Design an enzyme around this catalytic site. Structure first.
Site, PDB file in Angstrom:
ATOM      1  N   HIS A 408     -10.726  34.089  42.239  1.00  0.00           N
ATOM      2  CA  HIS A 408     -11.843  33.484  41.621  1.00  0.00           C
ATOM      3  C   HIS A 408     -11.684  32.019  41.635  1.00  0.00           C
ATOM      4  O   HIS A 408     -10.935  31.225  42.534  1.00  0.00           O
ATOM      5  CB  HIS A 408     -11.900  33.645  40.137  1.00  0.00           C
ATOM      6  N   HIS A 506      -0.803  36.825  27.393  1.00  0.00           N
ATOM      7  CA  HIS A 506      -1.243  38.160  27.383  1.00  0.00           C
ATOM      8  C   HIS A 506      -0.325  38.949  26.453  1.00  0.00           C
ATOM      9  O   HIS A 506      -0.308  40.227  26.834  1.00  0.00           O
ATOM     10  CB  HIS A 506      -1.935  38.812  28.595  1.00  0.00           C
ATOM     11  N   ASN A 551      -6.952  41.695  31.349  1.00  0.00           N
ATOM     12  CA  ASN A 551      -6.913  40.869  30.138  1.00  0.00           C
ATOM     13  C   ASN A 551      -7.149  41.833  28.950  1.00  0.00           C
ATOM     14  O   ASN A 551      -8.069  42.434  28.950  1.00  0.00           O
ATOM     15  CB  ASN A 551      -8.189  39.722  30.357  1.00  0.00           C
TER      16      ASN A 551
HETATM   17  C1  FAD Z   1      -5.392  29.926  26.955  1.00  0.00           C
HETATM   18  C2  FAD Z   1      -6.105  30.678  27.523  1.00  0.00           C
HETATM   19  C3  FAD Z   1      -6.065  32.293  27.145  1.00  0.00           C
HETATM   20  C4  FAD Z   1      -6.861  32.860  27.845  1.00  0.00           C
HETATM   21  C5  FAD Z   1      -7.290  32.676  29.158  1.00  0.00           C
HETATM   22  C6  FAD Z   1      -7.150  31.392  29.778  1.00  0.00           C
HETATM   23  C7  FAD Z   1      -6.553  30.397  28.835  1.00  0.00           C
HETATM   24  C8  FAD Z   1      -6.467  29.052  29.488  1.00  0.00           C
HETATM   25  N1  FAD Z   1      -7.973  33.813  29.752  1.00  0.00           N
HETATM   26  C9  FAD Z   1      -8.319  34.768  29.347  1.00  0.00           C
HETATM   27  C10 FAD Z   1      -9.136  35.889  30.130  1.00  0.00           C
HETATM   28  O1  FAD Z   1      -9.742  35.275  31.090  1.00  0.00           O
HETATM   29  N2  FAD Z   1      -9.534  37.003  29.434  1.00  0.00           N
HETATM   30  C11 FAD Z   1      -8.921  37.310  28.234  1.00  0.00           C
HETATM   31  O2  FAD Z   1      -9.227  38.386  27.457  1.00  0.00           O
HETATM   32  N3  FAD Z   1      -8.018  36.397  27.687  1.00  0.00           N
HETATM   33  C12 FAD Z   1      -7.862  35.226  28.010  1.00  0.00           C
HETATM   34  N4  FAD Z   1      -6.967  34.350  27.241  1.00  0.00           N
HETATM   35  C13 FAD Z   1      -6.338  34.569  26.001  1.00  0.00           C
HETATM   36  C14 FAD Z   1      -7.487  34.960  25.013  1.00  0.00           C
HETATM   37  O3  FAD Z   1      -8.007  33.563  24.741  1.00  0.00           O
HETATM   38  C15 FAD Z   1      -6.674  35.444  23.770  1.00  0.00           C
HETATM   39  O4  FAD Z   1      -6.202  36.879  24.043  1.00  0.00           O
HETATM   40  C16 FAD Z   1      -7.556  35.612  22.625  1.00  0.00           C
HETATM   41  O5  FAD Z   1      -8.079  34.378  22.406  1.00  0.00           O
HETATM   42  C17 FAD Z   1      -6.572  35.895  21.391  1.00  0.00           C
HETATM   43  O6  FAD Z   1      -7.500  35.926  20.101  1.00  0.00           O
HETATM   44  P1  FAD Z   1      -6.886  36.203  18.597  1.00  0.00           P
HETATM   45  O7  FAD Z   1      -8.171  35.756  17.757  1.00  0.00           O
HETATM   46  O8  FAD Z   1      -6.423  37.416  18.343  1.00  0.00           O
HETATM   47  O9  FAD Z   1      -6.123  34.651  18.598  1.00  0.00           O
HETATM   48  P2  FAD Z   1      -6.291  33.181  18.846  1.00  0.00           P
HETATM   49  O10 FAD Z   1      -7.364  32.991  19.686  1.00  0.00           O
HETATM   50  O11 FAD Z   1      -4.811  32.839  19.235  1.00  0.00           O
HETATM   51  O12 FAD Z   1      -6.405  32.634  17.483  1.00  0.00           O
HETATM   52  C18 FAD Z   1      -5.570  32.608  16.281  1.00  0.00           C
HETATM   53  C19 FAD Z   1      -5.918  31.899  15.239  1.00  0.00           C
HETATM   54  O13 FAD Z   1      -5.190  31.833  14.201  1.00  0.00           O
HETATM   55  C20 FAD Z   1      -4.842  30.360  13.734  1.00  0.00           C
HETATM   56  N5  FAD Z   1      -3.582  30.448  13.045  1.00  0.00           N
HETATM   57  C21 FAD Z   1      -2.491  30.358  13.656  1.00  0.00           C
HETATM   58  N6  FAD Z   1      -1.552  30.686  12.657  1.00  0.00           N
HETATM   59  C22 FAD Z   1      -2.105  30.576  11.545  1.00  0.00           C
HETATM   60  C23 FAD Z   1      -1.576  30.464  10.472  1.00  0.00           C
HETATM   61  N7  FAD Z   1      -0.188  30.678   9.920  1.00  0.00           N
HETATM   62  N8  FAD Z   1      -2.517  30.087   9.213  1.00  0.00           N
HETATM   63  C24 FAD Z   1      -3.709  29.945   9.461  1.00  0.00           C
HETATM   64  N9  FAD Z   1      -4.312  30.166  10.779  1.00  0.00           N
HETATM   65  C25 FAD Z   1      -3.451  30.338  11.670  1.00  0.00           C
HETATM   66  C26 FAD Z   1      -4.727  29.472  15.041  1.00  0.00           C
HETATM   67  O14 FAD Z   1      -5.278  28.408  14.745  1.00  0.00           O
HETATM   68  C27 FAD Z   1      -6.036  30.177  15.736  1.00  0.00           C
HETATM   69  O15 FAD Z   1      -7.205  29.686  15.571  1.00  0.00           O
END
Ligand code: FAD
Ligand code: FAD
Lengths: 577, 577, 52, 104
Positions: A408, A506, A551
């Site tokens: 890709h 991941h 993924n």
């Molecule tokens: C960075 C990235 C990720 C990615 C990717 C390419 C890049 C450059 N390509 C992907 C792909 O092609 N296919 C796929 O399935 N995943 C891909 N990824 C990863 C994917 O984005 C993640 O697996 C997914 O986004 C994870 O989802 P989840 O909802 O479980 O977690 P998150 O996105 O990391 O958000 C967590 C939120 O929690 C907030 N946070 C963290 N700690 C706290 C505390 N202590 N209190 C309150 N809030 C908190 C974080 O701010 C975040 O918003």
């Protein structure tokens, strides 16, 4: 800020938004907290790539990705700087500086591993690849009934794909895409199947794609509102959630301790149901800070009272990468339906094809684009249109090639010394291996060192397991070398290589799912409920207990959908005001 | 969209917002168009650095800045790659590719020049330094009356300083700031004066600084609303303004032609007053596309009908840069008032000082911060607290040292070879030189090559004028080497060097101001009105006709305030319907 | 020619991290003495450029 | 044009060349180990003043070539080591190894 909620969700990424979509939609009073802030425009938690400017300047989005990746655990730096002036202050040791973690063994790290604190989480920058896992990669949801397990996974996946707007047809009129896909399909005729990467995205025009995010799943606007007058939802950005308070019996959660980062003060928020979707790393940190698992450097002499498997069996995928420069044979094939008379630049120059001819190798849409580009841009030596969309090709994980592939053009990895080469020639290759879950591979948390939010500092003890994991990684690298040669040679500066552990992002297994806490060595059941606890749920890649190559997000979302069904069955929404 | 406005403003940067603040507040029906989109959360046009996450990870913002800087003119790449696989497609010439501008002579360029396309403009990422120009650097607003000219400039600057929220006390209690300030004050006692950089910012807490932006000047919310019920404003993001239509006499603007980027449609917008505030580069672009100045490669043989000085006399500053590592001498002086008993790490370890003792070198607040840090972090070899704000030091431009200086820690430039050195030791040095306007230094626009928005491709013809500009630039480099050595030695990887031409992003004089179009080779008068045209106004650094070293935003804003005074005197607001 | 006959007097133990080796490759668990490193040498109290 | 400035180093008892009783070099000889820091005070001060002087002087000729900016070189790259077996008049009073006839 309200005192009492039906449901409280920690984190506003796409998993947290799956919970919000289901529970807000079912009539629960929902509050959501994020540690990060409303960032990417008026559509809250939307994809940062969805601006006209980034789709015209795709090389620049790598800077946006890097700008919200904060390294999880950085060893103490021992680089020797000995060309400072004699006059400059110099310490006599490699002391702890610059946010370094002195708990981290640099040779057993996931140094590439990083976190994103913004509303929408990593879904504001991700690549939107949403493949399904086949049997060999996914956890069982039903014991001893493969067909019912299949039907349950299909049902969840169908729903998840619908929330994410996953499709396989957004790149169907891309020359480069079909060029590469068609070649690889031919080369592996009767051996491997190729298709478009399932992408969470919708095409809006031939030059604009609306990439999905948390916002697609749930729009994150406060409710009640004009379009949803009977719904209740509040989003609280810039709130660090610090711990869930356990009761004395360890049978239920009593509140959530938060820290509002604007005002500086701390609160106890009460709910019927608590959902942790702060990511694989930060879910575990919150749990350990709350008394689950074991704080500090692991020791089996004093085994934890709760969730002994927390932070063990962590999996992260091996990633190999390279880029290629399209072969002469492949570029020449783009114009194989054309009749060409004369020289470019001359008054007599003519490029035609016969529309709908049986003997045409390419469809009318392809030939029309090629013809127009060649006629309108006679100075240009390539038959590919300037505005042709990128390739989005995969051959999905199978027992005889147990790795995911992406062929890709990623927004990540843009660099400019090899930008002497025409971007139309360039294809990215990413092969992801799976990793056996092993008890010794751990994520743990310092009892002395804190992170930038005053929380126990994450520390990795990780090595890719010997045996199958390591063998499959070397076979994968070879496989990419073999396969990519069919398209073209390596682009200098982007030669085949393993990426730094964790850079693939991941991470799974940090709070893994299973049927039985003892026998499956796990932390949550198949409803994603923490064992022993009536009202605590965890969502995210942290639940996935298997060795997986694709993924994980879509699979995590499927698990969250199932978890919400359990919630909807066991907790009563409060009466509307 | 809508039919008829009193005032139409192109560009939503801080200059565009100055015109909106004045004009919306004066009762005018105002619409604003920006080619970029809403990008910084719920506060429209705000500084992207105002998130808790960036103020804790200052190293990451460099990515945000890089992520929104699109190079204005990139010459054809002639780097040789000869290690391609023989099988890859290779062209036999260095043909035009990847967005290159073939009009651009690579040796007469502003390679570092770049533009931002987002609501709020460059003020969503800028450093926020807002010093005044003294007489020698600034244009005359009043002829033959230096005291009346002074009074006019003081009146406008004061108002501008108020809109931007400029102050010089935000870093007063930083030990690093005072460490540096006091040392240079002492070293240059009676030769040069040193102070805090004047900064458009407000300190919110010990750890959080609210940086000013476009949003600080005008909130950019649609009016009428609750807080401004009798005000009329509409912002239209993702609208590329393409052309202003001149009437037959060249005395008035008839309309503005726009391109809605979401729908794709084009429209003709009418108003009484037209304001161009699209940046030094794109103001010129838009004007040249509208029939002002001259389209295409310059030739003297056929001089332009209108505004012949448009795009000539362009100036950009020289910028030299380095970083230093604090001297042993200065580090030790931080704790000179301390008495130390016992060894660090023991409960017997005791760091004390005597409040109010006349022999003390430092104030009580300074000694309290050192004591608490040394007692709480006994494994740390440095006396500076971890959370201590960065230095913000300047010696302002003077006849004897005619360059602006910033002695500080910038978001821009963060590296990874030299992050071995504790950041508390590191200081940035940036000296900015002035450049004499020459007719032969030019910005012009291709009659054949177009940009990503199908507009005439910008091209530079620029070299630093021989004579005073060159001599001063080299004297300035010497000055930085001499001065910085008072504080520490150079940080390896950040040695004294000139930056790429145009990286400083302070291009001026592209549509310059003067009293008389012919005599002063200019495009606008002192009310920023385009000569000959009753209802067209230009705002921004392109108006500044002088050689200047200091940061120009405050000065351009002062000019817009003056310009709005003329508008209020000459156009009647339409009646509130 | 000059570089081809300047042999370093005292080279500290190497502590650069290399974490992109294939999982399959032999990998050290410590920064052990190798490639002619002198384990007696404090890397911050060296004449690293000194040669014979 | 190349610019090289060489500063003098105050001779200090703590600055030592010693030889390992365990590790050997490629000729099976006791391996050389340095314990060396540029002395504080005059050496350090002169060293920075020297950097400034080069920066001032070289500017009268031209600007710096990119890639060759003003820098301190790695300690010992200059290869002007002295004092390892120093000369004086008297073994104890002058802390030395040979007299003025270079005799041990
Ligand atoms: C960075 C990235 C990720 C990615 C990717 C390419 C890049 C450059 N390509 C992907 C792909 O092609 N296919 C796929 O399935 N995943 C891909 N990824 C990863 C994917 O984005 C993640 O697996 C997914 O986004 C994870 O989802 P989840 O909802 O479980 O977690 P998150 O996105 O990391 O958000 C967590 C939120 O929690 C907030 N946070 C963290 N700690 C706290 C505390 N202590 N209190 C309150 N809030 C908190 C974080 O701010 C975040 O918003
Ligand atoms: C990037 C940067 C800039 C900067 C700085 C540090 C950085 C990293 N530090 C500064 C400092 O300390 N002190 C100072 O005075 N200036 C500093 N700068 C530069 C400063 O940000 C700019 O001088 C200032 O922002 C310019 O103001 P202005 O309003 O005149 O221009 P702008 O910010 O570039 O905004 C222009 C808007 O117009 C839109 N646009 C462009 N073309 C069109 C068309 N055709 N149609 C419609 N809109 C258009 C752009 O989208 C932009 O928003």
């Amino acid at each position: 800020m309200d005192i009492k909620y039906d449901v409280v969700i920690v984190g506003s990424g796409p998993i947290g938004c799956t919970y919000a979509r289901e529970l807000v939609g079912a009539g629960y009073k929902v509050a959501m907290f994020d540690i990060g802030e409303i960032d990417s425009g008026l559509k809250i938690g939307a994809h940062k790539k969805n601006t006209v400017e980034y789709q015209k300047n795709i090389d620049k989005f790598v800077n946006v990705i890097q700008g919200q990746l904060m390294s999880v655990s950085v060893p103490v730096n021992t680089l020797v700087v000995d060309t400072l002036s004699p006059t400059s202050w110099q310490a006599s040791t490699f002391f702890v500086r610059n946010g370094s973690n002195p708990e981290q063994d640099p040779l057993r790290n996931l140094s590439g591993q990083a976190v994103t604190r913004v509303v929408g989480g990593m879904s504001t920058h991700w690549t939107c690849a949403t493949p399904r896992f086949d049997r060999e990669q996914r956890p069982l949801l039903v014991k001893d009934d493969a067909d019912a397990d299949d039907a349950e996974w299909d049902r969840l996946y169908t729903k998840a794909e619908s929330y994410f707007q996953t499709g396989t047809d957004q790149f169907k009129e891309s020359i480069r895409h079909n060029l590469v896909l068609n070649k690889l399909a031919e080369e592996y005729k009767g051996q491997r199947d190729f298709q478009q990467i399932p992408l969470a995205a919708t095409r809006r025009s031939p030059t604009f794609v609306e990439w999905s995010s948390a916002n697609t799943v749930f729009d994150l606007q406060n409710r009640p509102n004009t379009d949803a007058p009977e719904e209740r939802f509040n989003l609280f950005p810039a709130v660090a959630c610090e711990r869930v308070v356990r009761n004395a019996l360890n049978s239920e959660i009593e509140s959530l301790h938060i820290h509002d980062l604007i005002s500086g003060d701390r609160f106890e928020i009460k709910a019927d149901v608590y959902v942790l979707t702060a990511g694989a790393v930060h879910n575990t940190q919150l749990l350990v800070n709350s008394g689950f698992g074991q704080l500090g450097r692991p020791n089996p002499t004093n085994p934890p009272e709760l969730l002994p498997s927390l932070g063990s069996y962590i999996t992260e995928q091996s990633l190999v990468f390279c880029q290629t420069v399209m072969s002469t044979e492949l570029i020449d094939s783009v114009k194989s339906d054309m009749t060409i008379r004369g020289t470019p630049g001359e008054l007599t120059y003519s490029v035609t094809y016969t529309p709908g001819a049986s003997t045409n190798k390419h469809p009318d849409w392809w030939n029309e684009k090629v013809k127009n580009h060649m006629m309108q841009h006679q100075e240009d030596p390539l038959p590919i249109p300037f505005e042709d969309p990128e390739p989005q090709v995969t051959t999905l994980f199978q027992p005889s090639h147990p790795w995911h592939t992406q062929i890709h053009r990623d927004a990540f990895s843009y660099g400019a010394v090899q930008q002497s080469i025409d971007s139309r020639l360039i294809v990215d290759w990413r092969f992801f291996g799976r990793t056996e879950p092993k008890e010794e591979n751990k994520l743990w948390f310092s009892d002395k060192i804190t992170d930038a939010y005053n929380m126990p500092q994450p520390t990795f003890d990780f090595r890719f397991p010997a045996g199958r994991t390591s063998k499959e990684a070397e076979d994968m690298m070879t496989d990419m070398c073999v396969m990519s040669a069919k398209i073209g040679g390596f682009l200098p500066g982007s030669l085949p290589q393993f990426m730094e552990p964790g850079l693939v992002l991941h991470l799974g297994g940090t709070h893994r799912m299973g049927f039985d806490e003892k026998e499956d060595n796990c932390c949550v059941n198949t409803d994603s409920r923490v064992f022993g606890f009536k009202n605590l749920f965890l969502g995210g890649c942290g639940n996935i207990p298997t060795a997986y190559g694709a993924n994980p997000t879509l699979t995590a979302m499927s698990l969250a959908i199932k978890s919400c069904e359990y919630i909807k069955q066991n907790f009563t929404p409060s009466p509307f005001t």
